């Protein structure tokens, strides 16, 4: 009458990166129903942060070379890409890179603290050659989905801004691999059955066990005004703690006492609040004025 | 064999003296029996289903 | 039917008696997936004896190893036919064409 | 003159169509011969040579 | 009977019992060469493409 | 012979045509790239090889 | 209860253009560039196989034993008859199995109207052709059951759901029951007022009648909200 759901789900982890899981009893093309419609989703229709735009001193155009630098502007780009970037609450974050010296200059060598956090502090970016080197750049990461190529916004650039932008390819996801296998399931009842094996690698943004998560429900997302037959949130809620206009104290609490959104701020009694680090009655009066103004409270649920 | 002689004194003997030799449907193959026909000896008792 | 074909099959399906065709040409008077009848209609046999012909096209018996040999009409009641086209089809043979 | 045919049937002049998937629905990269071959089973079937 | 029993039997049974294949001119050593066996539901016997 | 064909068209340089020198690191990029629509295989273009 | 993120543009239903009883035009506006491409292969594999439908299953007929024979002042042989039952487009409103009677006398052909009509059945051609009688005497009667399925299940299939089958005037006969023959789907960069980067995916399909669209999109997607279900934890 009606239909089966898999049963056997084995997750062999690699890595926290690369990842196969299997799911055994399967019916007819549902491995490919499945497979290829989450190969779709992962490789272009996702959440994650990338570089998107670069602004270094002195190299303007042609990608000129910059004195002292072992690679040129293109191998620069290269390694920008690969960031690992996952930010708190932000959807445009300016971050500068300032080093000197003979040696490697790695994502550690960039201003830190804190909104985004970068799972890779060890990712070569450049490398400088006489003592008397010194690199700067502007950096402007972007929160987006997809790939976007430098093609697509060059052509159809509506309104862009002057030299000094240098544009990047959005690694706007944190698949860096999504294939599948068919893999004719052996269930004793019928021989025609598929076992989906999903084979997963990714970057730190996310780890495969949520990006399958996070993929499948975004295509349960879609479809919901079709199923025979909880909503809803506040839009104030979703905001970072910067729309509070608070002190620089008390950003850095919420800050480093991972408190993202003010939707967990709101959330927190002062109880805990009594218990972050930096947080005396300065930071705490400061805390419910900002709050009681915009018609909300502290210690909600 | 004395062990068979046990075994059918032991769940009753009914030890038959006719082997058998039916025409089985070969396995493997299988489908509907379309047609029967029977081809009696000349001198020989027409058998009821004959 | 063979869709792309050479003109031929018509010729091979009739010559042998795998078909069953028509002794002489007349209007069917009845037909069946058992036996067709037909009347002559026209200049029968010289006296004037019992015009009308019958075909019994035999049904369901097996071949030489292994194969199904049946034929089927394929002309309704009240068709006119004439002498020498397909009254009854046999396997692989779609109304006068062969059919492999 | 198949061509021809072609013509007249209100179908490319090639004898190629551009075909999709169906496991992923995506298409093709050259537009492969589409068409009707006559075909026939063989004798030798297994069911019989197993 | 298959008693559908037997079949998970007939699994462990084969599980890493070789089966060795064979063509009909037998020109040189390679022309046997054993397999591990995996059960198909049906009546052909499948080959791998390289041997 | 149908596995090579294969090979051969996963190789075989095309001029310019949906191939820029758009690189990335490192042979994973093509498979997040090449499906789907960017832009081709055969495209003319470098990546960082280790 | 928190958080996490989120973003836009579910889809809609909008337009179902019925061209006949068997053709029909489903059409989903907003969409992405993108999931138009998605959804369109990924519903199509689901139409085209697991869909409910109801196909002639048994068949016994009177003074008929087995399906190789023949009935006097009948044009056809039995085995046709029980290919022309395979294409019986039945629609049942209530039940898993319902066994529809035939009778029928006289010269003329035997259409799908001749049988014993039911309130809980609607046929959707009642001039499909199933006899030719040609004996004025010629007269057939049939027990047709019609059951509900989905998967083409053939008459070898089950022979182990025999449990004592014994009547052998029973007539076992192939399903063929998915209601769905082709599917097509279109891109067709949408019309929307603003977000200028917008498709409708545009499904094509033609059915045996015994289903409309609405239903057929519905049971097909929520399939997928089923299999996806165990998608989401692990």
């Known amino acids: 009458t009606e239909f089966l759901k898999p049963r056997l789900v084995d997750i062999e982890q690699v890595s926290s990166t690369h990842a196969k899981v299997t799911l055994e009893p399967l019916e007819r093309g549902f491995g490919h129903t499945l497979g290829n419609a989450l190969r779709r989703i992962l490789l272009s229709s996702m959440p994650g942060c990338a570089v998107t735009e670069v602004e270094i001193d002195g190299v303007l155009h042609e990608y000129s070379t910059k004195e002292g630098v072992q690679e040129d502007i293109l191998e620069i780009l290269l390694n920008l890409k690969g960031l690992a970037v996952r930010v708190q609450g932000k959807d445009e974050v300016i971050l500068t890179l300032n080093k000197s010296g003979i040696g490697p200059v790695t994502a550690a060598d960039i201003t830190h603290d804190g909104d985004v956090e970068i799972v890779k502090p060890q990712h070569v970016i450049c490398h400088l050659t006489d003592e008397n080197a010194s690199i700067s750049m502007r950096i402007k990461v972007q929160r987006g989905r997809g790939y976007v190529p430098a093609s697509t916004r060059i052509h159809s650039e509506e309104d862009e801004r002057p030299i000094g932008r240098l544009l990047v390819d959005a690694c706007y996801s944190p698949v860096e691999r999504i294939a599948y296998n068919v893999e004719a399931a052996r269930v004793e009842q019928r021989t025609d059955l598929d076992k989906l094996v999903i084979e997963m690698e990714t970057n730190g943004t996310i780890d495969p066990e949520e990006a399958i998560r996070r993929a499948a429900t975004i295509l349960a997302e879609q479809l919901e005004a079709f199923v025979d037959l909880k909503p809803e949130f506040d839009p104030i809620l979703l905001r970072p703690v910067d729309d509070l206009e608070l002190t620089v104290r008390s950003a850095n609490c919420l800050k480093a006492e991972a408190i993202h959104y003010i939707g967990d701020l709101v959330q927190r009694t002062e109880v805990e609040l009594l218990k972050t680090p930096n947080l005396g009655k300065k930071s705490l009066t400061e805390i419910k004025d900002v709050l009681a103004s915009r018609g909300l409270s502290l210690g909600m649920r | 064999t004395p062990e068979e002689k046990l075994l059918r004194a032991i769940f009753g003997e009914k030890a038959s003296d006719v082997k058998d030799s039916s025409l089985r449907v070969p396995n493997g193959v299988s489908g509907t029996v379309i047609d029967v026909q029977v081809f009696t000896r000349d001198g020989v008792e027409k058998d009821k289903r004959a | ?100 | 003159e198949i061509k021809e045919l072609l013509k007249l049937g209100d179908l490319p002049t090639s004898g190629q169509i551009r075909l999709y998937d169906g496991r992923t629905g995506e298409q093709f990269e050259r537009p492969v011969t589409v068409g009707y071959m006559y075909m026939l089973k063989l004798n030798h079937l297994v069911d019989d040579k197993m | ?51 | 012979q149908d596995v090579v064909l294969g090979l051969y068209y996963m190789t075989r340089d095309c001029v310019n045509a949906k191939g820029e020198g758009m690189v990335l690191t490192g042979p994973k990029e093509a498979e997040r790239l090449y499906r789907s629509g960017l832009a081709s295989l055969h495209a003319r273009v470098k990546v960082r090889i280790t």
């Open chain 3, 1 to 100: 039917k063979p869709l792309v074909g050479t003109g031929m099959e018509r010729a091979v399906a009739v010559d042998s008696g795998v078909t069953a065709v028509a002794k002489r040409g007349g209007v069917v008077q009845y037909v069946d997936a058992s036996r067709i009848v037909i009347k002559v209609n026209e200049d029968e046999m010289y006296p004037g004896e019992a015009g009308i012909d019958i075909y019994n096209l035999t049904k369901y018996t097996r071949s030489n190893q292994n194969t199904c040999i049946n034929q089927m009409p394929c002309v309704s009641l009240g068709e006119p036919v004439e002498r020498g086209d397909v009254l009854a089809d046999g396997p692989s043979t779609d109304l006068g064409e062969l059919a492999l």
């Open chain 5, 1 to 51: 009977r298959e008693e559908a029993v037997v079949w998970d039997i007939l699994d462990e049974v084969i599980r890493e019992h070789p089966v060795l294949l064979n063509r009909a001119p037998t020109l040189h050593r390679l022309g046997i060469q054993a397999f591990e066996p995996v059960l198909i539901e049906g009546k052909a016997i499948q080959l791998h493409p390289l041997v």
